[PDB]
Amino acid sequence: SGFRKMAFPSGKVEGCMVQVTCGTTTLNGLWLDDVVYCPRHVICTSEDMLNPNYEDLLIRKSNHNFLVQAGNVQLRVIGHSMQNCVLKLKVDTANPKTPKYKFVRIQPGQTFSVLACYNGSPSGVYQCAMRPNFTIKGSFLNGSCGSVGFNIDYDCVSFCYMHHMELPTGVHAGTDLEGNFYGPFVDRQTAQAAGTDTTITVNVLAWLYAAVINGDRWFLNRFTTTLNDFNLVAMKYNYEPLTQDHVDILGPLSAQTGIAVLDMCASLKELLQNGMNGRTILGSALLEDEFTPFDVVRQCSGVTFQ
Amino acid sequence: SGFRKMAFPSGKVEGCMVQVTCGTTTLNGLWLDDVVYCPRHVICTSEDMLNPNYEDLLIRKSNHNFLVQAGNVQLRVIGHSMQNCVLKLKVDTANPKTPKYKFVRIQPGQTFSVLACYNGSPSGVYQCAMRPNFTIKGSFLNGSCGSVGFNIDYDCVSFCYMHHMELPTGVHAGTDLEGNFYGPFVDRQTAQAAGTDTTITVNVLAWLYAAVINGDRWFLNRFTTTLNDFNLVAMKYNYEPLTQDHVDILGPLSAQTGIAVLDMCASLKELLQNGMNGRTILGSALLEDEFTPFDVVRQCSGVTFQ
Ligand SMILES: CCc1cc(O)c(Oc2ccc(C(N)=O)cc2F)cc1F
Ligand SMILES: CCc1cc(O)c(Oc2ccc(C(N)=O)cc2F)cc1F
């Protein structure tokens, strides 16, 4: 019993974290096979983050300008290239701790674990979601760039995020492992403001099913609704519109608990219109939206990883 | 910026998790050097959890009755002994992934990371606190027994919890790694109810400092108070009494933010008496008490682990 914000085991990713230093800038890199991936703004100095021309800044960089340190050993850089907003540093040693892995570009609403690192050393792990405005609400300080977000399916690590920037509002932005930013953000210290932080409706519903499974049932009402009628309420509270795809994805949780998806929507509707009246759900006083339906099934069924 | 429920990197502990099977019962064990630690109720059957006599049940067990599997390899058990509520299974192979480690019995209010496991395979990691009633609010399903809680100080893993039981109320109980239960709980399926779940006052205050550091300052009032006057409010809301030791421990956070500890107490007092009026603090609608002062400093300063 009990439901917690749960991250994947980070050991497979810890063995891939290295320290990359260019000039006086040090951040983290990801060492997979014989390539080290890191944010391209490692080549930037302080005066340059306002308006960097990365192509021009890279002309003055050779392989030996990139210092890559794994633990206490220096990796030999034998080639380097820029792919979008990441650099790929070819090293002469394949990472012996390389796990089975994929590179995935996730959709908004999807969750992943972040291994926060500093100077190539892991500091902590927590669970994140890609917000609908393509930011993430993480915990990152100076030097955390290059920290990655990932999912694990048994023995395969799916890397989906690399941390690049912190916006003036305290939220965070980054790229996939191909170097393409999530959302409209750029690796420049400029005026870029995040859009509306809408709530991930399907995730709240999943979390409500998780609450029912674990004994929190006070919010179950006597009402039902339709997708169109619920979405009229979702729009007012800046909730994502619920689609039939979302209903379908919640099928398994609906079947296990015997509560029709549209019944749970009517329960959510009452919670949005009347608040929680000082009660709590799974130890929270607000509606949680960073659990996916698959996360709930995983944690309520005990899926492991080899 | 940003403040998150953050667990330690679990890689050092993942390499120690094994599967222990006795008869038809399978749970998790912790393999350090040439000893495997696991809950002693691995030797129990279903009819036996009501009133087990472990000394008698152990008489019918030999070394070869304990099947210990690390990954896909069978470990050779060459000795076994019961220490309080854990079994120590001497194996003939030292764990080559053994990290620097200690065994620590933590105090209530202290936090730690849990590596939830099933069949010796890690499933996820999350942060927990030892509640003042000596329970923990975890996420454990059948087969999770033997999962451990731990802290890391750079390169030393301090193991402080092994999971044993789930109470009828959905909370969790366990032992230190010497086999002594936290609180009055026993490894028997009996009537044992948890006491008052009081709030860890010093941890809430630490978390309020973390909020100030990250830009949430609306709760800062114009008032101050005394320890005795604040504690009169703490008692009403089932808060731990604050002591001078607690004030001293908050010194560093007080100095960094320039807010006297007793000023922050007066802010907490107003929050308890008037609620949050629908606002949030660090993304929460309730007062969080599972961050220690040391946790806040760690996450706000970027401490790493080698
Ligand atoms: C030119 C691109 C660029 C380079 C930087 O080095 C940079 O610096 C930071 C990045 C992230 C954080 C944080 N806390 O996540 C803090 C930082 F100072 C920002 C930035 F856009
Ligand atoms: C005789 C001692 C004993 C043996 C058990 O095997 C047991 O079983 C469970 C333990 C923990 C959980 C959970 N979800 O944490 C679930 C369980 F069924 C309980 C118990 F007291």
PDB file of all heavy atoms in Angstrom, chain A residues 25 41 44 48-50 52 54 140-145 163-166 172 186-189 192, chain B residues 1, ligand 1:
ATOM      1  N   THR A  25      34.416  26.649 -18.208  1.00  0.00           N
ATOM      2  CA  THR A  25      33.056  26.185 -17.973  1.00  0.00           C
ATOM      3  C   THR A  25      33.066  24.678 -17.759  1.00  0.00           C
ATOM      4  O   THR A  25      33.611  23.932 -18.579  1.00  0.00           O
ATOM      5  CB  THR A  25      32.146  26.540 -19.151  1.00  0.00           C
ATOM      6  OG1 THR A  25      32.192  27.953 -19.390  1.00  0.00           O
ATOM      7  CG2 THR A  25      30.716  26.120 -18.870  1.00  0.00           C
ATOM      8  N   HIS A  41      26.450  24.795 -24.931  1.00  0.00           N
ATOM      9  CA  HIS A  41      26.854  26.044 -24.299  1.00  0.00           C
ATOM     10  C   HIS A  41      27.993  25.856 -23.297  1.00  0.00           C
ATOM     11  O   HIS A  41      28.371  26.825 -22.623  1.00  0.00           O
ATOM     12  CB  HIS A  41      25.646  26.737 -23.652  1.00  0.00           C
ATOM     13  CG  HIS A  41      25.105  26.065 -22.430  1.00  0.00           C
ATOM     14  ND1 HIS A  41      25.892  25.699 -21.360  1.00  0.00           N
ATOM     15  CD2 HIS A  41      23.834  25.749 -22.087  1.00  0.00           C
ATOM     16  CE1 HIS A  41      25.132  25.162 -20.421  1.00  0.00           C
ATOM     17  NE2 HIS A  41      23.879  25.187 -20.835  1.00  0.00           N
ATOM     18  N   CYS A  44      30.656  28.340 -24.104  1.00  0.00           N
ATOM     19  CA  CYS A  44      30.356  29.753 -23.952  1.00  0.00           C
ATOM     20  C   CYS A  44      30.979  30.327 -22.687  1.00  0.00           C
ATOM     21  O   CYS A  44      31.114  29.648 -21.667  1.00  0.00           O
ATOM     22  CB  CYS A  44      28.845  29.971 -23.914  1.00  0.00           C
ATOM     23  SG  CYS A  44      28.041  29.727 -25.491  1.00  0.00           S
ATOM     24  N   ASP A  48      29.272  35.825 -23.468  1.00  0.00           N
ATOM     25  CA  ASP A  48      28.692  35.233 -24.663  1.00  0.00           C
ATOM     26  C   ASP A  48      27.278  34.710 -24.461  1.00  0.00           C
ATOM     27  O   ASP A  48      26.618  34.371 -25.449  1.00  0.00           O
ATOM     28  CB  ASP A  48      29.573  34.080 -25.163  1.00  0.00           C
ATOM     29  CG  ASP A  48      30.666  34.543 -26.106  1.00  0.00           C
ATOM     30  OD1 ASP A  48      30.341  35.157 -27.148  1.00  0.00           O
ATOM     31  OD2 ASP A  48      31.851  34.286 -25.806  1.00  0.00           O
ATOM     32  N   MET A  49      26.777  34.537 -23.255  1.00  0.00           N
ATOM     33  CA  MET A  49      25.432  33.897 -23.206  1.00  0.00           C
ATOM     34  C   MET A  49      24.337  34.851 -23.701  1.00  0.00           C
ATOM     35  O   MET A  49      23.189  34.388 -23.755  1.00  0.00           O
ATOM     36  CB  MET A  49      25.088  33.363 -21.814  1.00  0.00           C
ATOM     37  CG  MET A  49      25.601  31.945 -21.580  1.00  0.00           C
ATOM     38  SD  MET A  49      25.069  30.738 -22.836  1.00  0.00           S
ATOM     39  CE  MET A  49      23.486  30.228 -22.173  1.00  0.00           C
ATOM     40  N   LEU A  50      24.589  36.144 -23.881  1.00  0.00           N
ATOM     41  CA  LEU A  50      23.496  36.998 -24.336  1.00  0.00           C
ATOM     42  C   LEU A  50      23.126  36.677 -25.777  1.00  0.00           C
ATOM     43  O   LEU A  50      21.944  36.554 -26.112  1.00  0.00           O
ATOM     44  CB  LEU A  50      23.872  38.476 -24.199  1.00  0.00           C
ATOM     45  CG  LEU A  50      22.839  39.511 -24.658  1.00  0.00           C
ATOM     46  CD1 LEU A  50      22.129  40.151 -23.471  1.00  0.00           C
ATOM     47  CD2 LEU A  50      23.502  40.591 -25.522  1.00  0.00           C
ATOM     48  N   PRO A  52      25.115  34.192 -28.320  1.00  0.00           N
ATOM     49  CA  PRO A  52      26.206  33.357 -28.832  1.00  0.00           C
ATOM     50  C   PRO A  52      25.958  32.914 -30.264  1.00  0.00           C
ATOM     51  O   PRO A  52      24.829  32.596 -30.651  1.00  0.00           O
ATOM     52  CB  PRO A  52      26.209  32.158 -27.875  1.00  0.00           C
ATOM     53  CG  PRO A  52      24.776  32.042 -27.442  1.00  0.00           C
ATOM     54  CD  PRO A  52      24.203  33.447 -27.431  1.00  0.00           C
ATOM     55  N   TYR A  54      27.175  29.883 -32.010  1.00  0.00           N
ATOM     56  CA  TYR A  54      27.867  28.652 -31.644  1.00  0.00           C
ATOM     57  C   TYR A  54      28.776  28.166 -32.764  1.00  0.00           C
ATOM     58  O   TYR A  54      29.882  27.678 -32.508  1.00  0.00           O
ATOM     59  CB  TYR A  54      26.838  27.589 -31.265  1.00  0.00           C
ATOM     60  CG  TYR A  54      26.190  27.858 -29.926  1.00  0.00           C
ATOM     61  CD1 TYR A  54      24.996  28.557 -29.833  1.00  0.00           C
ATOM     62  CD2 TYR A  54      26.791  27.439 -28.757  1.00  0.00           C
ATOM     63  CE1 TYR A  54      24.411  28.813 -28.603  1.00  0.00           C
ATOM     64  CE2 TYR A  54      26.221  27.683 -27.533  1.00  0.00           C
ATOM     65  CZ  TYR A  54      25.036  28.368 -27.455  1.00  0.00           C
ATOM     66  OH  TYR A  54      24.482  28.605 -26.218  1.00  0.00           O
ATOM     67  N   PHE A 140      17.532  22.384 -10.046  1.00  0.00           N
ATOM     68  CA  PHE A 140      18.800  22.524 -10.749  1.00  0.00           C
ATOM     69  C   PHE A 140      19.500  23.782 -10.265  1.00  0.00           C
ATOM     70  O   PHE A 140      18.880  24.847 -10.190  1.00  0.00           O
ATOM     71  CB  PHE A 140      18.596  22.607 -12.265  1.00  0.00           C
ATOM     72  CG  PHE A 140      18.059  21.348 -12.886  1.00  0.00           C
ATOM     73  CD1 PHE A 140      16.783  21.314 -13.421  1.00  0.00           C
ATOM     74  CD2 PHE A 140      18.835  20.206 -12.951  1.00  0.00           C
ATOM     75  CE1 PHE A 140      16.292  20.168 -14.005  1.00  0.00           C
ATOM     76  CE2 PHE A 140      18.346  19.056 -13.538  1.00  0.00           C
ATOM     77  CZ  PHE A 140      17.076  19.034 -14.060  1.00  0.00           C
ATOM     78  N   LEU A 141      20.779  23.654  -9.935  1.00  0.00           N
ATOM     79  CA  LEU A 141      21.624  24.791  -9.595  1.00  0.00           C
ATOM     80  C   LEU A 141      22.732  24.908 -10.631  1.00  0.00           C
ATOM     81  O   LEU A 141      22.879  24.059 -11.512  1.00  0.00           O
ATOM     82  CB  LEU A 141      22.209  24.645  -8.187  1.00  0.00           C
ATOM     83  CG  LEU A 141      21.184  24.532  -7.060  1.00  0.00           C
ATOM     84  CD1 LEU A 141      21.863  24.146  -5.761  1.00  0.00           C
ATOM     85  CD2 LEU A 141      20.411  25.838  -6.895  1.00  0.00           C
ATOM     86  N   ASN A 142      23.514  25.982 -10.528  1.00  0.00           N
ATOM     87  CA  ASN A 142      24.606  26.190 -11.468  1.00  0.00           C
ATOM     88  C   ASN A 142      25.528  24.980 -11.478  1.00  0.00           C
ATOM     89  O   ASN A 142      25.930  24.480 -10.424  1.00  0.00           O
ATOM     90  CB  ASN A 142      25.392  27.445 -11.098  1.00  0.00           C
ATOM     91  CG  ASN A 142      26.558  27.689 -12.027  1.00  0.00           C
ATOM     92  OD1 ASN A 142      26.393  28.253 -13.110  1.00  0.00           O
ATOM     93  ND2 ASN A 142      27.748  27.262 -11.613  1.00  0.00           N
ATOM     94  N   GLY A 143      25.879  24.522 -12.673  1.00  0.00           N
ATOM     95  CA  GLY A 143      26.684  23.333 -12.828  1.00  0.00           C
ATOM     96  C   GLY A 143      25.894  22.062 -13.046  1.00  0.00           C
ATOM     97  O   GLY A 143      26.501  21.006 -13.279  1.00  0.00           O
ATOM     98  N   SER A 144      24.565  22.126 -12.985  1.00  0.00           N
ATOM     99  CA  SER A 144      23.736  20.947 -13.194  1.00  0.00           C
ATOM    100  C   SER A 144      23.469  20.668 -14.666  1.00  0.00           C
ATOM    101  O   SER A 144      23.001  19.574 -14.994  1.00  0.00           O
ATOM    102  CB  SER A 144      22.403  21.110 -12.461  1.00  0.00           C
ATOM    103  OG  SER A 144      21.625  22.127 -13.066  1.00  0.00           O
ATOM    104  N   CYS A 145      23.749  21.619 -15.556  1.00  0.00           N
ATOM    105  CA  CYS A 145      23.545  21.388 -16.978  1.00  0.00           C
ATOM    106  C   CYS A 145      24.225  20.095 -17.399  1.00  0.00           C
ATOM    107  O   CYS A 145      25.274  19.720 -16.871  1.00  0.00           O
ATOM    108  CB  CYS A 145      24.082  22.568 -17.783  1.00  0.00           C
ATOM    109  SG  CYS A 145      23.196  24.098 -17.403  1.00  0.00           S
ATOM    110  N   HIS A 163      19.419  18.735 -19.443  1.00  0.00           N
ATOM    111  CA  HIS A 163      19.116  20.036 -18.864  1.00  0.00           C
ATOM    112  C   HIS A 163      20.053  21.099 -19.411  1.00  0.00           C
ATOM    113  O   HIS A 163      21.273  20.907 -19.431  1.00  0.00           O
ATOM    114  CB  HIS A 163      19.233  19.995 -17.345  1.00  0.00           C
ATOM    115  CG  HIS A 163      18.949  21.307 -16.698  1.00  0.00           C
ATOM    116  ND1 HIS A 163      17.751  21.968 -16.859  1.00  0.00           N
ATOM    117  CD2 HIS A 163      19.717  22.096 -15.910  1.00  0.00           C
ATOM    118  CE1 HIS A 163      17.794  23.108 -16.194  1.00  0.00           C
ATOM    119  NE2 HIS A 163      18.972  23.206 -15.603  1.00  0.00           N
ATOM    120  N   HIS A 164      19.481  22.231 -19.823  1.00  0.00           N
ATOM    121  CA  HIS A 164      20.248  23.302 -20.446  1.00  0.00           C
ATOM    122  C   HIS A 164      20.118  24.642 -19.745  1.00  0.00           C
ATOM    123  O   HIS A 164      21.141  25.295 -19.483  1.00  0.00           O
ATOM    124  CB  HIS A 164      19.814  23.496 -21.898  1.00  0.00           C
ATOM    125  CG  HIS A 164      20.366  22.483 -22.843  1.00  0.00           C
ATOM    126  ND1 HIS A 164      21.300  22.802 -23.803  1.00  0.00           N
ATOM    127  CD2 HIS A 164      20.097  21.165 -22.999  1.00  0.00           C
ATOM    128  CE1 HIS A 164      21.595  21.721 -24.501  1.00  0.00           C
ATOM    129  NE2 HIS A 164      20.871  20.717 -24.041  1.00  0.00           N
ATOM    130  N   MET A 165      18.890  25.077 -19.438  1.00  0.00           N
ATOM    131  CA  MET A 165      18.633  26.453 -19.026  1.00  0.00           C
ATOM    132  C   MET A 165      17.663  26.490 -17.853  1.00  0.00           C
ATOM    133  O   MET A 165      16.846  25.587 -17.667  1.00  0.00           O
ATOM    134  CB  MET A 165      18.040  27.291 -20.175  1.00  0.00           C
ATOM    135  CG  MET A 165      18.741  27.131 -21.505  1.00  0.00           C
ATOM    136  SD  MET A 165      20.275  28.062 -21.553  1.00  0.00           S
ATOM    137  CE  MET A 165      19.649  29.736 -21.744  1.00  0.00           C
ATOM    138  N   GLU A 166      17.732  27.579 -17.084  1.00  0.00           N
ATOM    139  CA  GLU A 166      16.748  27.896 -16.060  1.00  0.00           C
ATOM    140  C   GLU A 166      16.138  29.243 -16.420  1.00  0.00           C
ATOM    141  O   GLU A 166      16.867  30.216 -16.625  1.00  0.00           O
ATOM    142  CB  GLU A 166      17.389  27.947 -14.677  1.00  0.00           C
ATOM    143  CG  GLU A 166      16.415  28.267 -13.559  1.00  0.00           C
ATOM    144  CD  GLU A 166      17.076  28.232 -12.193  1.00  0.00           C
ATOM    145  OE1 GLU A 166      17.944  29.101 -11.923  1.00  0.00           O
ATOM    146  OE2 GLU A 166      16.726  27.325 -11.396  1.00  0.00           O
ATOM    147  N   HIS A 172      12.503  25.151 -15.711  1.00  0.00           N
ATOM    148  CA  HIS A 172      13.672  24.617 -16.391  1.00  0.00           C
ATOM    149  C   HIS A 172      13.332  24.143 -17.796  1.00  0.00           C
ATOM    150  O   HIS A 172      12.218  23.693 -18.073  1.00  0.00           O
ATOM    151  CB  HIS A 172      14.279  23.477 -15.559  1.00  0.00           C
ATOM    152  CG  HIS A 172      14.607  23.879 -14.152  1.00  0.00           C
ATOM    153  ND1 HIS A 172      13.967  23.344 -13.053  1.00  0.00           N
ATOM    154  CD2 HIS A 172      15.489  24.790 -13.669  1.00  0.00           C
ATOM    155  CE1 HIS A 172      14.460  23.886 -11.953  1.00  0.00           C
ATOM    156  NE2 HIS A 172      15.382  24.770 -12.299  1.00  0.00           N
ATOM    157  N   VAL A 186      15.434  28.492 -26.404  1.00  0.00           N
ATOM    158  CA  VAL A 186      16.767  28.533 -27.060  1.00  0.00           C
ATOM    159  C   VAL A 186      17.852  28.622 -25.988  1.00  0.00           C
ATOM    160  O   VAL A 186      17.565  29.124 -24.918  1.00  0.00           O
ATOM    161  CB  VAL A 186      16.874  29.717 -28.036  1.00  0.00           C
ATOM    162  CG1 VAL A 186      15.879  29.592 -29.162  1.00  0.00           C
ATOM    163  CG2 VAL A 186      16.697  31.045 -27.328  1.00  0.00           C
ATOM    164  N   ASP A 187      19.062  28.193 -26.295  1.00  0.00           N
ATOM    165  CA  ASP A 187      20.172  28.269 -25.387  1.00  0.00           C
ATOM    166  C   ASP A 187      20.892  29.631 -25.491  1.00  0.00           C
ATOM    167  O   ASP A 187      22.026  29.729 -25.866  1.00  0.00           O
ATOM    168  CB  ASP A 187      21.149  27.095 -25.583  1.00  0.00           C
ATOM    169  CG  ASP A 187      21.549  26.865 -27.030  1.00  0.00           C
ATOM    170  OD1 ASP A 187      21.062  27.555 -27.920  1.00  0.00           O
ATOM    171  OD2 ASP A 187      22.337  25.955 -27.258  1.00  0.00           O
ATOM    172  N   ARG A 188      20.177  30.652 -25.067  1.00  0.00           N
ATOM    173  CA  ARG A 188      20.577  32.063 -25.084  1.00  0.00           C
ATOM    174  C   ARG A 188      19.944  32.657 -23.835  1.00  0.00           C
ATOM    175  O   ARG A 188      18.836  32.289 -23.497  1.00  0.00           O
ATOM    176  CB  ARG A 188      20.024  32.822 -26.295  1.00  0.00           C
ATOM    177  CG  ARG A 188      20.201  32.161 -27.651  1.00  0.00           C
ATOM    178  CD  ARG A 188      19.520  32.975 -28.739  1.00  0.00           C
ATOM    179  NE  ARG A 188      19.929  34.362 -28.632  1.00  0.00           N
ATOM    180  CZ  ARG A 188      19.139  35.417 -28.763  1.00  0.00           C
ATOM    181  NH1 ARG A 188      17.889  35.279 -29.158  1.00  0.00           N
ATOM    182  NH2 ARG A 188      19.613  36.620 -28.496  1.00  0.00           N
ATOM    183  N   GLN A 189      20.645  33.580 -23.216  1.00  0.00           N
ATOM    184  CA  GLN A 189      20.143  34.309 -22.024  1.00  0.00           C
ATOM    185  C   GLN A 189      19.346  35.470 -22.599  1.00  0.00           C
ATOM    186  O   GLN A 189      19.909  36.537 -22.770  1.00  0.00           O
ATOM    187  CB  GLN A 189      21.311  34.771 -21.156  1.00  0.00           C
ATOM    188  CG  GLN A 189      20.934  35.171 -19.746  1.00  0.00           C
ATOM    189  CD  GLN A 189      22.090  35.783 -18.996  1.00  0.00           C
ATOM    190  OE1 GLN A 189      23.178  35.227 -18.925  1.00  0.00           O
ATOM    191  NE2 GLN A 189      21.857  36.945 -18.418  1.00  0.00           N
ATOM    192  N   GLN A 192      12.658  34.906 -22.706  1.00  0.00           N
ATOM    193  CA  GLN A 192      11.792  33.805 -23.117  1.00  0.00           C
ATOM    194  C   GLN A 192      10.960  33.401 -21.907  1.00  0.00           C
ATOM    195  O   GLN A 192      11.506  32.916 -20.910  1.00  0.00           O
ATOM    196  CB  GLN A 192      12.599  32.625 -23.656  1.00  0.00           C
ATOM    197  CG  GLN A 192      13.939  32.405 -23.005  1.00  0.00           C
ATOM    198  CD  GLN A 192      14.748  31.323 -23.703  1.00  0.00           C
ATOM    199  OE1 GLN A 192      14.243  30.617 -24.578  1.00  0.00           O
ATOM    200  NE2 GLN A 192      16.009  31.183 -23.313  1.00  0.00           N
TER     201      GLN A 192
ATOM    202  N   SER B   1      17.589  26.655  -9.177  1.00  0.00           N
ATOM    203  CA  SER B   1      16.335  26.950  -8.433  1.00  0.00           C
ATOM    204  C   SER B   1      15.433  25.711  -8.426  1.00  0.00           C
ATOM    205  O   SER B   1      15.809  24.707  -9.063  1.00  0.00           O
ATOM    206  CB  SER B   1      15.626  28.141  -9.024  1.00  0.00           C
ATOM    207  OG  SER B   1      16.451  29.296  -8.979  1.00  0.00           O
TER     208      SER B   1
HETATM  209  C1  LIG C   1      24.288  30.623 -23.115  1.00  0.00           C
HETATM  210  C2  LIG C   1      23.448  29.466 -22.587  1.00  0.00           C
HETATM  211  C3  LIG C   1      23.521  29.370 -21.075  1.00  0.00           C
HETATM  212  C4  LIG C   1      24.694  29.012 -20.462  1.00  0.00           C
HETATM  213  C5  LIG C   1      24.739  28.939 -19.078  1.00  0.00           C
HETATM  214  O1  LIG C   1      25.916  28.576 -18.454  1.00  0.00           O
HETATM  215  C6  LIG C   1      23.626  29.208 -18.301  1.00  0.00           C
HETATM  216  O2  LIG C   1      23.810  29.123 -16.914  1.00  0.00           O
HETATM  217  C7  LIG C   1      22.898  28.393 -16.148  1.00  0.00           C
HETATM  218  C8  LIG C   1      22.140  27.359 -16.640  1.00  0.00           C
HETATM  219  C9  LIG C   1      21.283  26.676 -15.787  1.00  0.00           C
HETATM  220  C10 LIG C   1      21.168  27.021 -14.441  1.00  0.00           C
HETATM  221  C11 LIG C   1      20.209  26.266 -13.519  1.00  0.00           C
HETATM  222  N1  LIG C   1      20.098  26.570 -12.119  1.00  0.00           N
HETATM  223  O3  LIG C   1      19.547  25.407 -13.929  1.00  0.00           O
HETATM  224  C12 LIG C   1      21.943  28.044 -13.968  1.00  0.00           C
HETATM  225  C13 LIG C   1      22.813  28.709 -14.816  1.00  0.00           C
HETATM  226  F1  LIG C   1      23.580  29.714 -14.353  1.00  0.00           F
HETATM  227  C14 LIG C   1      22.427  29.578 -18.928  1.00  0.00           C
HETATM  228  C15 LIG C   1      22.399  29.657 -20.326  1.00  0.00           C
HETATM  229  F2  LIG C   1      21.299  29.992 -21.027  1.00  0.00           F
END
